[PDB]
């Protein structure tokens, strides 16, 4: 376990390290492409089918 993995037995414990993230969000990255759906909605609805 000390060589295939880490988990070095120091002072009387196997020690874990950081296993987390930041979770960023923009939610206006879709604002280019959600506009592409809305233009497509009025596209097919206005065309003589």
């Amino acid at each position: 376990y000390a060589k295939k993995r880490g988990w070095v037995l120091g002072p009387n414990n196997y020690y874990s390290f950081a296993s987390q993230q930041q979770k960023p969000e923009d939610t206006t990255i879709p604002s280019t492409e959600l506009a592409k759906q809305v233009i497509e909605y009025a596209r097919q609805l206005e065309m003589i089918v």
């Binding site: 206006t28 604002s31 280019t32 959600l34 506009a35 809305v38 233009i39 609805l45």
Partner: protein, 154 residues
């Protein structure tokens, strides 16, 4: 608009126009019954009118119903916009209440008699296409203009 041109009575037998083309004979109408009752073709003759246009006024007669970019980038107000959507859907429920009755009803009546018992208060299928068009074009433009104010601005 209308314009006329007097003719003599001394030449009532002799011809008054030589008629070398079709442009003032059968075009723009045959003369109306309430105007030939006094006039055409006694004592005068009618005449044709068109519209010449210089390019300079033609270009500005085209564009006088448009606005600035302020009108193109409004977001009306979300309180009344939700209130308007709350309004229209509410009677649209009631239009659907009446729509279930009439479509199911269909008395076998050879439908011109359906088309005489509907003048009155009867209105399924007519408001139902109408309010959907209003709920469509309001919600799409209110979304799509709010889309651009984030992509463009900052």
């Amino acid at each position: 608009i209308d314009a006329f041109r007097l003719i003599n009575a001394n030449m009532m037998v002799l011809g008054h126009e030589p008629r070398q083309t079709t442009s003032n004979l059968g075009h723009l109408n045959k003369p109306s019954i309430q105007a030939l009752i006094h006039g055409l073709n006694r004592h005068y003759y009618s005449i044709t009118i068109n519209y010449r246009k210089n390019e300079l006024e033609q270009k500005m007669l085209l564009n006088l119903h448009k606005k600035s970019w302020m009108e193109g980038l409004t977001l009306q107000d979300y309180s009344e916009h939700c209130k308007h959507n709350e309004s229209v859907v509410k009677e649209m429920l009631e239009l659907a209440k009446n729509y279930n009755k009439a479509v199911e009803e269909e008395d076998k009546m050879t439908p011109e008699q359906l088309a005489i018992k509907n003048v009155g208060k009867q209105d399924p299928k007519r408001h139902l296409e109408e309010h959907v068009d209003v709920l469509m074009t309001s919600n799409i433009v209110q979304c799509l203009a709010a889309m651009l104010d984030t992509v463009v601005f900052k």
